[PDB]
Write a protein that binds this DNA or RNA. Structure first.
Ligand SMILES: [Mg+2]
Ligand SMILES: [Mg+2]
Ligand SMILES: [Mg+2]
Ligand SMILES: [Mg+2]
Ligand SMILES: [Mg+2]
Ligand SMILES: [Mg+2]
Ligand SMILES: [Mg+2]
Ligand SMILES: [Mg+2]
Ligand SMILES: [Mg+2]
Lengths: 138, 176, 199, 190
RNA sequence: GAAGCUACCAUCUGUGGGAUUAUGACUGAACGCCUCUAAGUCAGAAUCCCGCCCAGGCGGAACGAUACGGCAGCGCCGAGGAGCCUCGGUUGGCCUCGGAUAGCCGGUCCCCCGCGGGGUCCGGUGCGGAGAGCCCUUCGUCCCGGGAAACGGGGCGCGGCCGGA
RNA sequence: AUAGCGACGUCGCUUUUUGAUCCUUCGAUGUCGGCUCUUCCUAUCAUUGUGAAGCAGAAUUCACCAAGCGUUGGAUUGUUC
RNA sequence: UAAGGCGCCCGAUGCCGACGCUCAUCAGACCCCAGAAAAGGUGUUGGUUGAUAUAGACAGCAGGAUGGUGGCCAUGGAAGUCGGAAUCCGCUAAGGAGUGUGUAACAACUCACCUGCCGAAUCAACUAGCCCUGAAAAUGGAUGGCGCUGGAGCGUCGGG
RNA sequence: GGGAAGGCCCGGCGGGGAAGGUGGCCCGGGGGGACGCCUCGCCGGCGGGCGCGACCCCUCC
């Protein structure tokens, strides 16, 4: 079954191309594999864009199928897409990936040191729990 | 013509040189879809030589300039009247496309002609390009996009960038 | 350091080209479960192609003529050989770095097998097209070990299911322990979260 | 041209229930259960509407070549529903000129033996498909009844026992002998 | 005329399956009906492939015995002892479900069958139970303190029990 | 008209007939037949499985998958024929 | 850089290349060049022209499908159905001196045409792309090979 | 083309138009939420049901 459709007013996340990594709102469907979109608030000038480079999110905001950028921005601000996107888990994973990429060598060493303890404690406690479960089974 | 890249629309006006017979020959204007102004002028001379008794040696390009799209943010339906050469005989046709720019629609027309009839740019003679209302549209491939509540999914997304993780332990997912 | 590939779902030539390039580049490659490989085009077409290959033999002495191997592993081996300069020492040394197998032998069943998305059927073929199974093609061309390998694969699958269940149980213990000890491993977690290894 | 959407809906009666796991459908009713998968069609099946009222088939972005599969899926599902609620009864008759055709049923309707087909010393032995029951019709001189739930199985058995009796090396326009499907109805009528 | 060779000039023996071609069909749309075809399904042969049969690979397997009694040569072990010559490449490991893709993955008692398999429900889903990942992480030693551990670490240090074709 | 044929036309295929040419060979590639022996082709005479007849049966036509297996013994002639 | 190329052989697309077309039980794949035509396809994709359809079509399922008259010349027999011209009228919602099957002739069936149910698009005739039929030779065999079908094929194109 | 669009200020404001018709209205159904018909749950209570007839009584999507 399909849950994410392409209609007027859906928010999609651009994966690659000029505006890579930005949200955008679908205004119209030009053709089978091209849509007229704009990110009035995410800094993306109104333009055409292929379907091959956007990934659909589960955010819908209402405006007519050819409304101008004024009304598109009005609907975007009214629905407050930015904070909800920042709060969703998708953006959290993206932001964490960006953090890991940005990490320099000193924080790499610090992360190694912290992970050593984290794994050691977890492994010891897991051994304790496994022994306890075995004793309970016996 | 070599339909290189995306075409551009040029307004080209030309006239015969003044002669003792007539001081001021009438100026003739034409719309040329071309990669650049040089080939635009060449096509203008070709068409005007077919139409009138005019040649480049006995004429002059009074003006030649690109005409920009009037509304490049409104998706429009374009009807194109076209004249092309097959392997046996020549035919007139009318085709509709859906795009934001007249030049983009004409480029789509050239690519579609090459794909469907193996006709080449030196065979296609473009005749008329008009904005056509959705009620006046008559090709179903364009008409099916005329509704307020358009809605369709992307069913089978094929994995691109197949080579960046050239060896990956997942079998990729095609349902998003 | 050896690249272990799984054949199931991969296309013959598409996988063979990548394997040949990797082998020529010096890497040791072992491809496994060759009878799961599939070829585009319908089964009758592919069977006809293999029969046409079978028909090619030296008229005066077939014993010296082309050798038509019937096992799927050897079929894949030969189509890989077709993409290497096997008449030279470099090509022969490369070809010696490749190992093919039907099913999954004991040296490799207890290992993680890699996957090549650039040669996968689900990626390279639209669903409306027809494909053929190399295992069935070989079996009804004259491969004699389709059933034995099937039973052995069934045994391997039923053992791997037990191993995977044990892995699931052990990890679940791991997660329960993690949420149990979050109290005293919290100060070790915010650093990973700030550097984006745990969010 | 690829159509944006092609859909068609099927209404199911109250006495029968339908459960689908992806593209395989299971139909359960008074006469039994029928299962059929459709993984070779690649369209969308939805059991929309509480009270299991309807089953909808969707196809997005399909040319005319695969647009035909929607109605064939719907027809297959309707046939499964009909065979589950009512069942399928294929009635066939044996036509002969001189030699009577002696048909005897064994394995409680699973095997059909045909003898004396044009003075034949050979004995035709045809096995029914699993779930198809053969019988000799009462209140009729010579007629066979095939009972089943799967229309494909019943009709395949009928075709098998029809093609088992064909004249060889003779004018089939004159030697009109054999068993032919007289009509195809249901076990019980509405 | 022995023996031996030897003759349709004597006598004996000569095989079974599978996918399918042509063709005939089932269900069934496209195209309200129809249709062997488009998706799916069936029967199908001196053909094809294999079996039976002949050979047996710079292809493997199991098993037996493995060099005196004056010398001796051998096999296994002593985490057995120093070395000498020669051939090189390498410069951290990942020890594993099956598989789908017009769908998947993980928990669950709230139920049903034989710990496993189903049902409901709850979570994730551009895969944070991720290979775009995980694990180990090495300058060394000496004092005192805090955090984790007291169940842990190390032992051809041990004797057994299972685990594998 | 089209079971089976097919006029007046017109489009092809083959190199098992003959031509046309003269590229190789004249410090030589032994130049007709028959005998013997193997393999290959199908444009299928028979046999296996089919479809169509102006196919009642018998016989016989036309067509399809198809070269697996067979295709003889003699008079006359150096003959191929 | 030219010409030519960039899946592997084999240096170069390991571009998140663009738009389409095409399934081949003989696919196709680059000047010279190394193999094919006339004629066809309800395979599929475009295009041209003309029709009829809420005064309710196209299917499909059902009812009618009449008198003069078995029209005239005819043949042994021709009632419509082998033959020669014409083809009228009243009844009609409609019926042709007849579209076909059938008998020696009838008979009978059936069609043109009109009605009932169903309620929105449906018919043709051409034309051009790819694919398919046409398409048969001898040692086993050659888009250079492997192989390729979200193309590594065909057409138009872009960066590198 | 002394850039073509575009942005902001409801710019104001002049009139006009249909449609890929927003509300509104009419018809139809998929519904539900008040759950108004049974069944359990604790004669009064709330929660359990993953309850069960509704029907223009509305009432929302
Ligand atoms: Mg006969
Ligand atoms: Mg068989
Ligand atoms: Mg068939
Ligand atoms: Mg079969
Ligand atoms: Mg070294
Ligand atoms: Mg010689
Ligand atoms: Mg000599
Ligand atoms: Mg032949
Ligand atoms: Mg090259």
């Amino acid at each position: 079954v399909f849950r994410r459709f392409v209609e007027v007013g859906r928010v999609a996340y651009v994966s690659f191309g000029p505006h890579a990594g930005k949200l955008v709102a679908i205004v119209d469907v030009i053709d089978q594999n091209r849509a007229l979109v704009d990110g009035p608030c995410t800094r993306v000038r109104r333009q055409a864009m292929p379907f091959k480079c956007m990934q659909l999110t589960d955010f819908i905001l209402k405006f007519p199928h050819s409304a101008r950028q004024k009304y598109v921005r009005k609907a975007w601000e009214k629905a407050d897409i930015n904070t909800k996107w920042a709060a969703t888990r998708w953006a959290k994973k993206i932001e964490a990936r960006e953090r890991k990429a940005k990490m320099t060598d000193f924080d790499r060493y610090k992360v190694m040191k912290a992970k050593k303890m984290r794994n050691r404690i977890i492994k010891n406690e897991v051994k304790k729990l496994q022994r306890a479960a075995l004793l309970k089974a016996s | 013509m070599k339909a290189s890249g995306t075409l551009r629309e040029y307004k080209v006006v030309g006239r015969c040189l003044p002669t003792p017979k007539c001081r001021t020959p009438p100026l003739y204007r034409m719309r040329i879809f071309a990669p650049n102004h040089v080939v635009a002028k060449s096509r203008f001379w070709y068409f005007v030589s077919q139409l009138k008794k005019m040649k480049k040696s006995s004429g002059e390009i009074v003006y030649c300039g690109q005409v920009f799209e009037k509304s490049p943010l409104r998706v429009k339906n374009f009807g194109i009247w076209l004249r092309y050469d097959s392997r046996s005989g020549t035919h007139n046709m009318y085709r509709e496309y859906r795009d934001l720019t007249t030049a983009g629609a004409v480029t789509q027309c050239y690519r579609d002609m090459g794909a469907r009839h193996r006709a080449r740019a030196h065979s296609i003679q473009i005749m008329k390009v008009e904005e056509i209302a959705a009620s006046k549209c008559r090709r179903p491939a364009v008409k099916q996009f005329h509704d307020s509540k358009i809605k369709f999914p992307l069913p089978h997304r094929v994995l691109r960038r197949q080579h960046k993780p050239r060896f990956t332990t997942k079998r990729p997912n095609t349902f998003f | 350091q050896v690249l272990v590939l799984d054949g199931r779902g991969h296309l013959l030539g598409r996988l063979a080209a990548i394997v040949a390039k990797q082998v020529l580049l010096g890497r040791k490659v072992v491809v496994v479960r060759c009878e799961g490989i599939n070829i585009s085009g319908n089964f009758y077409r592919n069977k006809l192609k293999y029969l046409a290959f079978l028909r090619k033999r030296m008229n005066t002495n077939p014993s010296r003529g082309p050798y038509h191997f019937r096992a799927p592993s050897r079929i894949f081996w030969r189509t890989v050989r077709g993409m290497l300069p096997h008449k030279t020492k470099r090509g022969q040394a490369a070809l010696d770095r490749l190992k093919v197998f039907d099913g999954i032998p004991p040296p490799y069943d207890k290992k993680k097998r890699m996957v090549v998305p650039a040669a996968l059927k689900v990626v390279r073929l639209k669903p409306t097209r027809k494909f053929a199974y190399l295992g069935r093609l070989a079996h009804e061309v004259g491969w004699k070990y389709q059933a034995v390998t099937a039973t052995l694969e069934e045994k391997r699958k039923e053992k791997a299911k037990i191993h995977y269940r044990k892995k699931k149980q052990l990890m679940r213990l791991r997660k329960q322990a993690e949420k149990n000890v979050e109290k005293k491993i919290s100060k070790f977690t915010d650093v990973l979260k700030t550097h984006g290894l745990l969010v | 041209m690829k159509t944006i959407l092609s859909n068609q809906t099927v209404d199911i009666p109250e006495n029968v229930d339908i459960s689908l796991k992806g593209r395989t459908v299971i139909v359960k009713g008074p006469r039994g259960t029928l299962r059929r998968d459709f993984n070779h069609i690649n369209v969308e099946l939805s059991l929309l509407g509480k009270k299991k009222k309807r089953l909808r088939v969707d196809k997005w972005w399909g040319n005319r070549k695969e647009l035909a599969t929607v109605r064939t899926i719907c027809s297959h599902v309707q046939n499964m529903i009909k065979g589950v609620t009512l069942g399928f009864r294929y009635k066939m008759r044996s036509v002969y000129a001189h030699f009577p055709i002696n048909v005897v049923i064994q394995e409680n309707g699973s095997l059909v033996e045909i003898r004396n087909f044009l003075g034949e010393k050979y004995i035709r032995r045809v096995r029914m498909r699993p779930g198809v029951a053969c019988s000799v019709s009462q209140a009729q001189k010579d007629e066979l009844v095939l009972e089943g739930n799967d229309i494909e199985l019943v009709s395949n058995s009928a075709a098998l026992i029809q093609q088992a009796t064909t004249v060889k090396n003779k004018d089939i326009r004159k030697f009109l002998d054999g068993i032919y499907v007289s009509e195809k109805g249901t076990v019980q009528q509405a």
